[PDB]
Amino acid sequence: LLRILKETEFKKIKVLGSGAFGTVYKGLWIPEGEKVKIPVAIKELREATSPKANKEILDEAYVMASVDNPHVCRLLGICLTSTVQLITQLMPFGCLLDYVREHKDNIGSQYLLNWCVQIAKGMNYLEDRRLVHRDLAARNVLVKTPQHVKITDFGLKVPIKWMALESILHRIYTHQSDVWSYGVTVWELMTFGSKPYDGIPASEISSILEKGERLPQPPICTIDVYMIMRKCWMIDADSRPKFRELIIEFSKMARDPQRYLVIQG
Ligand SMILES: O=C(Cc1ccccc1)Nc1cccc(-c2nc3sccn3c2-c2ccnc(Nc3ccc(N4CCOCC4)cc3)n2)c1
Numbered sequence: 001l002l003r004i005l006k007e008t009e010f011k012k013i014k015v016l017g018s019g020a021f022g023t024v025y026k027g028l029w030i031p032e033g034e035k036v037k038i039p040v041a042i043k044e045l046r047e048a049t050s051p052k053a054n055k056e057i058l059d060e061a062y063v064m065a066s067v068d069n070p071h072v073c074r075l076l077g078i079c080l081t082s083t084v085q086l087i088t089q090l091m092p093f094g095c096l097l098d099y100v101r102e103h104k105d106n107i108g109s110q111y112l113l114n115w116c117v118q119i120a121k122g123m124n125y126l127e128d129r130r131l132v133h134r135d136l137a138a139r140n141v142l143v144k145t146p147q148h149v150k151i152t153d154f155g156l157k158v159p160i161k162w163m164a165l166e167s168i169l170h171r172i173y174t175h176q177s178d179v180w181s182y183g184v185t186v187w188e189l190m191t192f193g194s195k196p197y198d199g200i201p202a203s204e205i206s207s208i209l210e211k212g213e214r215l216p217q218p219p220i221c222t223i224d225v226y227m228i229m230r231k232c233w234m235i236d237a238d239s240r241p242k243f244r245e246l247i248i249e250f251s252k253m254a255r256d257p258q259r260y261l262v263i264q265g
Contacts, residue, residue: 027039061078
């Protein structure tokens with residue numbers, strides 16, 4: 001259920017954006033035997049990170065091409081050349097981070113709280129599949145429509161400001177560390193794409209954490225919301241909430257958004 005592509009079957013057409021893992025293109029799939037060309041999204045990765053062999057790269061692709069959840073972006077094809085190219089269904093909206101920045105203060109409670117639930121449902125799917133994301137951030141949550149988001153790049157500098165303490169201290173990555181990152185993601189959303197710890201150098205993040213300081217309460221959040229975010233940042237991984245609890249809690253809040261998020265509008 002993963003299409004291995006030959007450069008002859010597709011073609012990048014325009015650059016749509018660039019980040020750390022690589023560049024995003026609008027592309028076209030040329031089905032052989034036909035006169036049409038089908039739009040696709042191609043993500044060309046920045047290689048040379050630890051020069052891996054292709055069969056070792058495909059082993060992984062096959063797993064990401066195996067996900068089935070409405071809130072998890074699935075790998076559809078892969079083209080292994082000089083560079084590694086990931087193909088998926090093209091969406092018109094790109095990442096949640098930019099989306100929320102573009103709609104800075106004109107986004108409503110219902111939307112925020114729903115993205116929170118959707119992100120948790122996606123994360124809970126991955127947990128059930130025994131997959132650890134490692135870099136869950138709003139930049140990694142794609143928008144299919146403004147009411148339907150999909151998490152991407154599970155298993156792909158170090159996002160210190162998104163990492164749980166143990167990942168920082170020991171490079172320990174678990175579903176519980178994904179919970180931490182999830183709380184940061186929620187925080188980005190609630191602040192409309194603000195940079196976590198604006199100003200503080202990464203080098204100093206372990207110490208402020210250790211000393212018990214946490215990301216500040218977003219002005220739009222009530223204490224119940226902030227309380228949840230904060231629970232995601234406990235030092236003791238096992239005392240952090242589970243994604244299934246998170247789905248439930250946010251589901252409840254989304255049932256009466258205006259009560260849990262205070263936005264002028
Ligand atoms: O194969 C997989 C699964 C996976 C799971 C586990 C491990 C590895 C891979 N994932 C994947 C594949 C291909 C691209 C990507 C991607 N990575 C990113 S970051 C942002 C957007 N994407 C996409 C993206 C994707 C599709 N379609 C669009 N469409 C689209 C529409 C507007 C824009 N714009 C940018 C400028 O302003 C807004 C308009 C930009 C793009 N994007 C992800």
